Amino acid sequence: PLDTTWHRPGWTIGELEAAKAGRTISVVLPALNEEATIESVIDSISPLVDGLVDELIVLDSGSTDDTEIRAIASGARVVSREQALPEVPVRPGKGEALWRSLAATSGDIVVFIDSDLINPHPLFVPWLVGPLLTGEGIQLVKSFYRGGRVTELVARPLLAALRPELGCVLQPLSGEYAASRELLTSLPFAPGYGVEIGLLIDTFDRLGLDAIAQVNLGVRAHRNRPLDELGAMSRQVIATLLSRCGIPDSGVGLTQFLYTRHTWPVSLVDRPPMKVMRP
Template identity: 50%
Template sequence: MLDEVGHWLRRRSWNAADRPLDQLLAAKRRTGTTVSVVLPALDEEETVGRIVSVIRRDLSALVDELVVMDSGSTDRTAEVAAAAGAKVIHRDEVLPRLPPSPGKGEVLWRSLLATHGDVVCFVDADLREFSASFVSGIVGPLLTDPDVAFVKAMYDRPLDGLPAGGGRVTELVARPLLNLHWPRLAGVVQPLGGEYAARRSLLERLPFPVGYGVELALLIDALETAGLDALAQVDVGVRHHRHQDGQALGRMAAAIYATAERRLPRGSGRGLTPLIQFDRDASGAFVPRDHVLVTEERPPMRTVPEYAPRGTYV
């Protein structure tokens, strides 16, 4: 298996600089491929405007559609994103017959109904020091290599002065799970990263967990559906973003475990819910708090009557 991973790394790992923008634009014209960029956002007024502005300024010829999917923000996220030039769509406006569930995966799933590009690129809206290479880098292989269907960004994630101190849920939960149960994915540097692009014709065939487990699920299901050689990753440098506290990381880890458990042959599919965590009360005593984890998954978008399939990935 190590040989297979090594072979994949040599053939399917690149740097964003390997494909200059003029090369991507030539490939886009030649193939007629359209590109949608989706930013799922929840209370990201401090960062979303800068990301939208950079994409609009540097990638206007590459990106056909730039959509901010608002997941119920209570701040000025929608206003700031629209002022910067994005099309803003509220989660509840898409597929109104189906009450929305809370969570990032829900927004990503609904974005397939709200966009039209042949290639869909997801970018988290909390990134700081954002570079256009986060988009062009991961879209590039999909424009230039017809055999590639799903591309993850890879990067350093600094934390507290350590160049690679971030990604704690990745290192403590996701990576061990992948190495144990899906070793062909052991070469993926950032399996939980929120920046990735894929052909719509693949995404529309995959189920989407409504919560934090969506990135792991899409990666595993893309492997099972399209095969390892259809997956790739591109180095885009350094990712600066907001980090979570320990309890939030615990809930994320539980969601990742529940998502993986559903995909194991012996899994019961029930997931891990609720999760018990502890806080101190005013007297200093530890008090248990239960957090109900939403483990629901949305079906492949191709099965939704309101969705018009754009073709089938081969």
């Protein structure tokens, strides 16, 4: 019931560029300690810059490895969380990085690509902007691909429980997606790893499915992470998913026993629509 592109899109890069019609395109790579993979990601996209893509930045989210220098050495403009929006003290987590990135870009369209990807296709970005450029009323495009543990155990089943209309979204937690600035600066940003699911639900609640498309980027592979770190992500995802369905979340961080005790942070605080930051 949702515009789904199942096979390779047929649009060429030159067509897509024509279709821009004065609209600009920014690409954001959020990055926290992805030195091993960041360069490969930037290189997959930088050939588009000054063409289809008018602007590409790395939003460095507090990295302490060589993420930033290697990214710079790949010719990318690197922006710290502090630099994107310096008047506002920095909070931890991905959603903060993406939210701040709105203040550090000016494209009418914004594309997000995770910086921990292993050999991403150089057509990811063209594939994602296709529906925004050539559709009508599309404001949001999610990717999917071909094993998604938080997605298949947490997000998809909870959506089935609480927003079953979104059951047709194959990769709701996908980190590769694009959306209009008009949409993005109109929506709040959930903290931490909650940011994607919030955007999907907020978009839907506000514009319905017809405003959402999804595109097959084939197959992704990325940094596989330790189960305890996913419990933490899953917690924040849950937190946000619930607060969008008007359910009071305890605000209690998930506690695991490695036996040694550890309690991960959770946040019930969204960033407001970036629009409010407009002077």
